[PDB]
Design a protein around this nucleic acid. Sequence first.
RNA 1: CCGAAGCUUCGGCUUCGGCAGGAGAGGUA
Lengths: 83, 48, 226, 237, 692, 63, 574, 21
Amino acid sequence: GGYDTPLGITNPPIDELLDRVSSKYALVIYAAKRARQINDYYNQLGEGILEYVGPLVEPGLQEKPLSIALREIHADLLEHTEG
Amino acid sequence: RVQGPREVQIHLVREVQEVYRAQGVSIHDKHIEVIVRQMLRRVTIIDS
Amino acid sequence: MLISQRPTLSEDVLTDNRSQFVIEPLEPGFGYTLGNSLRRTLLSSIPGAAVTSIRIDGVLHEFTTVPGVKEDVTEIILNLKSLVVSSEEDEPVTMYLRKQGPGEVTAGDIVPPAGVTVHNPGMHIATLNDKGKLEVELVVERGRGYVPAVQNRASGAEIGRIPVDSIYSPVLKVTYKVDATRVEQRTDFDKLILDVETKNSISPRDALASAGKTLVELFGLARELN
Amino acid sequence: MLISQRPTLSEDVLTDNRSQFVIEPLEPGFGYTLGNSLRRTLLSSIPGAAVTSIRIDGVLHEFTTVPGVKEDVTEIILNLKSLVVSSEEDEPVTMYLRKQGPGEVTAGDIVPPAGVTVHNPGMHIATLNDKGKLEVELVVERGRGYVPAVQNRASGAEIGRIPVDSIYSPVLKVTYKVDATRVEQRTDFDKLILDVETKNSISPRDALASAGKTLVELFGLARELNVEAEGIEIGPS
Amino acid sequence: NNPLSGLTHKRRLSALGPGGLSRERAGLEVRDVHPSHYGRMCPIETPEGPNIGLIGSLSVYARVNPFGFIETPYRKVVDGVVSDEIVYLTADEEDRHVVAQANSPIDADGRFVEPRVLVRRKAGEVEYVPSSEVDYMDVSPRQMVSVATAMIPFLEHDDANRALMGANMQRQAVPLVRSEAPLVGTGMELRAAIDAGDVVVAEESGVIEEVSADYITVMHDNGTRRTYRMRKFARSNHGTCANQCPIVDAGDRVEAGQVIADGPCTDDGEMALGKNLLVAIMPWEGHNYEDAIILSNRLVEEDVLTSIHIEEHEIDARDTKLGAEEITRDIPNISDEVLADLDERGIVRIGAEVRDGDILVGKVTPKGEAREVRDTSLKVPHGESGKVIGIRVFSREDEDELPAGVNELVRVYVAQKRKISDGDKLAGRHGNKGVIGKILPVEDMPFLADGTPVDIILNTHGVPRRMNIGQILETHLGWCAHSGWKVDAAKGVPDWAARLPDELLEAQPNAIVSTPVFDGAQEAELQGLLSCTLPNRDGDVLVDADGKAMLFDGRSGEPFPYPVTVGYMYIMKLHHLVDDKIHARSTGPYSMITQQPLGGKAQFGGQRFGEMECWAMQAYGAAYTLQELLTIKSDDTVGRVKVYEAIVKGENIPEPGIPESFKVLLKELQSLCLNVEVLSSDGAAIELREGE
Amino acid sequence: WLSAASFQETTRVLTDAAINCRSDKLNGLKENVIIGKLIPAGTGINRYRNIAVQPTEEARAAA
Amino acid sequence: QCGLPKLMALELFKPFVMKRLVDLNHAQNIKSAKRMVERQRPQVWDVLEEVIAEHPVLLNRAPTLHRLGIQAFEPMLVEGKAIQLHPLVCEAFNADFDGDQMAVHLPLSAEAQAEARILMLSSNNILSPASGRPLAMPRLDMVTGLYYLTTEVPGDTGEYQPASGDHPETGVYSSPAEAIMAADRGVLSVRAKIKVRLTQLRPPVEIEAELFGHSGWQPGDAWMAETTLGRVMFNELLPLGYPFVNKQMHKKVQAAIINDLAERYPMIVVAQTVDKLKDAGFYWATRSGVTVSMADVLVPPRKKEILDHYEERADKVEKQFQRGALNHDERNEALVEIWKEATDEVGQALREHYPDDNPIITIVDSGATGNFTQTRTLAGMKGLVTNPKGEFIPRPVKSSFREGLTVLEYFINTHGARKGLADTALRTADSGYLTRRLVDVSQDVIVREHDCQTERGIVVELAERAPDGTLIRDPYIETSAYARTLGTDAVDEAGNVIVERGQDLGDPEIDALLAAGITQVKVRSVLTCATSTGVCATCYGRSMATGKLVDIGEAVGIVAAQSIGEPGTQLTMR
Amino acid sequence: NSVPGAPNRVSFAKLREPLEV
RNA sequence: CCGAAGCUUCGGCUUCGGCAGGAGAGGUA
Ligand SMILES: [Mg+2]
Ligand SMILES: [Zn+2]
């Protein structure tokens, strides 16, 4: 599109996030399950050995795992199946 | 009883919309059909 | 055709509190923004002095009455807010008002320290009948702007000190008027006429010069490139 | 008195002739004192040169269409008023443009009068197609700001000296917005975000560098009535 | 709240109660303005909620029969001439006579000028009869209004709904530390303050002998001396301040009935509930959008709208089956740094600044006979502060009445001073009402040609569509009264000033005028006075003949392109302040039967998530937000703690359990002899009691 | 009976249900709200609640 | 965005702050961090700026009459004790600023945060779910600012003068920047007609076809515009590829522009565009000179003559009755019929006296607020009033509110002013019981599948033909035929097909059908669905809130009851 | 009026009153 | 669940101390 850069909570633009999914009800579960995997990785890396995968994209200074999950979704680095 | 099930739904969806259109409120007909659909879902037994 | 006549300032005195300043010939348009730059710097950032706490002897809070005075303490406080004080030292100075017996307490009864001068020797502070005395200890300080009351038990003070609101601005009213010269032969210019009215602590030509230092030092983080 | 927090200027080069200067943190209220006067000093104090009159040949009266060229006189004026010129002289000079033949007369044809220069010699002025000749005599003088046509009255010497408008300013569009920042527990601070767009004869950074030298000597007529005045010191750089 | 509310409470006619009606049974015919209310009940002053029409106010001239029927006076007219004989008539006797109208032209002798007059016939039928049938006449134009409605200038230019709100909102104003009377008034304010009873008047004639801040001594002519005391900083029923001040000198001569001391909302004997402020009617950058208000900073730096509020706290010392509670400073559980503001008796000392969670009195409870002492101390509640201004201790041994079973009582009074801020409610006398949107520096404000900033900015989009144009007339007359005027009579009195009195042809700066409720200043008079006003220090007239002035922009410096309306208006401060409405909570106390969070602001309670708010959640499709909102934030006892631990440790939030209210419902159903069970996929009822 | 008892006339519906020995399957919006479960609409339905997400093979190999 | 007080965000975000405080080595244990937070030590005002970053909250106002009564924002720390709300959400919240209060709620888990950020964000909910019309639209002050800016005033400063002999065009500009520089000097007015060379603005359709033909590569192609400066500065707010408008911005025109943008562009440029329309509206509202004074409420010029004539016509009827001819109702009826024509002659004299540059006229003529009935009441005459029973009083109110009513006129004016307020208060308790009854019956209707492949349907009128042979579009067609799925193909004169089975009915399909001689159409409706439980997505049609087909799992049942219940307090006629 | 000591508030009224409240 | 006090191996252990329901009236949106 011809929009200016989004700021804050409106990044990434949702009109492109909705092109990777079937509806807006599956995006919620997609993002909310990747965020939980990232948080488990963060809280299990400092203790022992785990099986999950860390952030596939470079994080910021203090970024919420939900933002990293949405950025991973927007970059076409994940895949999902529907029940 | 005189006309049939299909004409009661037109009479209802029209008599309800006249009241709202008199004062200038715009509501789609698909919103009243959902509620009218639930008013005609049962059958009365004459003889069993 | 480009002009060369550099702007020139010139003052005229109408009283000892009011003055006017003419600044011709500016460029067509640059006549209202210079006036507003100086009015917005003259009514905010001029340093001065103001009272910041009182201490009567016998009173503890500000919601009470002294015996023999016809006002409560909140009216002596709301009448000690129109005192024009001056100072030269950067440290609190303690004044002293001690009057007794029938009469009327004014501002000429405050024996000042050495560096403080009261500029209103004829204001009202209270009325006394033959049964009361007023012993106050005012603390004067210097600053800039309007600072609200500095709380008591958040500054390490006792139980008799009454904080007070302090307004430190020595300026009263400022306005401007532009007289435009819109002739043909495209030879246009402007002319600003500022009017500055100060209370009584600062002459109308020392306030324009404190705003001229502030503005000659804030428009200098721009010519740092060239 | 000290300011507490010293402001700092920073740039953000967008294109080659456009930038975005930011000045923060500014004490509450000083974002509107520095905005309008920087915009006006930028758009009406920097000197420059521009075309002030033309004298196209073949137009004793009715200024409608000139023989040979494919444009009306108004399009010739609009194309001969967006010329980025500059001159190192004092009094009015004179330029000439004489192209004869099927082609497209352009700004790379006005022979420069040894001293004045044209910095955009790629603009299209007209398209001489029907085998004719164009002869234009322009007068480029210097000034400041936007001066509307100086309608003359020579009554004889002005046989057809069409008067044009003169955009002498080297800056073309300035806009400003005041935002807000936080310094500690106190919000309601300020942040100025200018946006200067210039021509091809000055760079956007010499503007906010020569517009802080005509304001540090205009507000310097006040700090000389009493040199010791107890202002607000900003501190060392 | 203020003297007007107290006076109005005592003049109320209520249609409910033990023997009347109900708020639910009452229909639509008992809430109507009957034609027989003319002169007996006020049609405007009434509540706005579910009690609309069920509560009313008595009129100014009304009086009650020895039977219980309200009467009203009339002037008897005979042979077309109005006499001066007053007869009181009940509603059942005035429907057999033709009663004229108060606003009727009457000559010097007393004959009607107009050939025909507007009268009131039998069944409240209004007609235009030729003036020869009239039998009675009204006594005054304000016969049909109450005491609060008769205080609105230019009432006849306002719609009924806006005048209703203005009368209702005049009783919610708070007293300020300094009072000042209106520039434009009505004349009812003098006898509405003496009759209310919050002033001090002299019962006899004499000279003043001694005056102080708390007593006045008057020597009578016969020899007797009488002294009057004052209430300094007393707390009213609603937490406001009731302060009385003397307004006499030490040698003045005083006549019987003269006001000697002021009161809460009184200025020199007349009621004053607000302040005079300079107004501009214009939109401003959207900060006064949709009924918001923009203020200046001079209203905070100069204490224009500031009020004092007082609070009261108590505690009780009683006996116990294990001993006797005692008030003392010695507490073996807490440190000595927080016990420094207490005296040798366990109470705070006067003049100490308390804060939230601070200590007021120190009391301990024995547990039986040492180390049997427990701690139960009265502390300042959440979000309170202020100095301590008084302590009242009651004891049993000093012969004081006390409830049986208690030994000592103590009360502590705490006072604070509140300035104006964002969120506070302002109002006028005409229905204007809004909260403060912004407070601006005085250099950021539009200013007149001589450099005078404006004090308040109001929007122009709300006036035309609500039909309260009395406020614009009020601003015009207020500007004329503030500046002062003078009518030229060199070539005789002008045509527009023919009916003006001779004392209104010239006025001084800061003059006070009066426009009665239904007979006041016309519009020809205002339009003619707007072009006669005096100049200022320099010979300039800032406001032209239309009442409009040219203002400068304080942020950019350029003049505004069109003239703007300027004037003075009367602004009151309403008792709906934002400091008493802010609240927040993360966790706190819970209930007992159903273990949900408590309710209310005093108990640190939560906010209801009602039924209508669940439908929005279900229509959005949000199945997880609702589940979290209903289980782990309200009732799940075991999940609340795990959620808190997970949040603190940074882990993932756990899975919700089952709410407790469901189990309470099941035990309720089982107690009515109902065999309700929760089955599984293959029968085998689940226990649903935990324990494992 | 759970959805009808919470609308109106609690006593009548409870008495009739008690006499008839009715059974509730807890398959509606109101009942699932009452007992504390996920409503069968929006994100609470089976298709969306059982989504499995894992990184793609190429991204997993790269990192 | 919203604005949240510091002392409220500190209490709402306590555990996140305690965790962050312990993590950054500012404390030792959880109890130490708890005490430090509760004591408001100066170390907690910096962690509570990255703790609340990108953490949404929910704002709610009661009563919640529809979906948009709850929305999710992103908090910002402000100074004060009040919450700051955007001007464009007041229509959805139904919130003025004279004392309202709202509540805040905080999502905790990942699923709740994702739902708030995706499903409930305010910038995602712009279109109304009951009719598909935009809700976040300019209103009140913004409408006046944008109507003042885009208005053409003939004979203004620096307009185009087509002169000859003495001087040329004198008023042609070579760029908008030059026009702005001229307007900063006073030579040119914003609302004066000029000719300006535009380069980065897309020409209208006809100009583009005439000049460029194949396509207009607008990044660098120049044309000529005959417009004003305000229209150029207005069109510089719309997206880049939007063609030039050149019209005066009445409220209807703004609504049309917004609807077109919403239906043809992504949902982020619309949210970015409304925010910059609001800025210009607010900026130009304060420089438009709208103000109220008692010398702007002009009275009718010749009013006493009109009234005297229509009073003689009544005294004849009165004389007649005095002798005898009519009973009583005939009298009252003829008096009503004289005093119902006098108010219309006064109205039509008032609508001819008032000039068109009056502040009172341009507030009702721009669509901001108000009617002309109020303007006639304020400056003309009030007219006939009603008694408590509900019948007109044969005597009128001849005085406007600008002259002031008398005692009797003011008293008889309150009979109808009290009834409205009592009926208003009473009819707010009979529409929330209707809503509660409607929600419960239709609470089990949910979209369950995508298509039932049924063949039934209903018949839709879709315009009728006049005797001459010209079709008349049905007045109610936006709410009966738009946004539906066809059931059978639309054929005409035994010819080809224009649209196919299973296609949404937008305006292009409607006009294509109408321009081929088709009136009756067969659509697919929810009344004739074959699904056992719930409904299917194809039969329901298109969702009004988003503009595409419905989603499997939506709750079409609650939206239908919250679309029929809110519109109800605004319903009372007799 | 009719009260011993009161501020002088001039009035615009044109009608007289035969009764006191 | 919170506070006070001890042991504390740093996971925690021990002693003591501690609660929140109805009716009526007025008001704001
Ligand atoms: Mg409201
Ligand atoms: Zn179907």
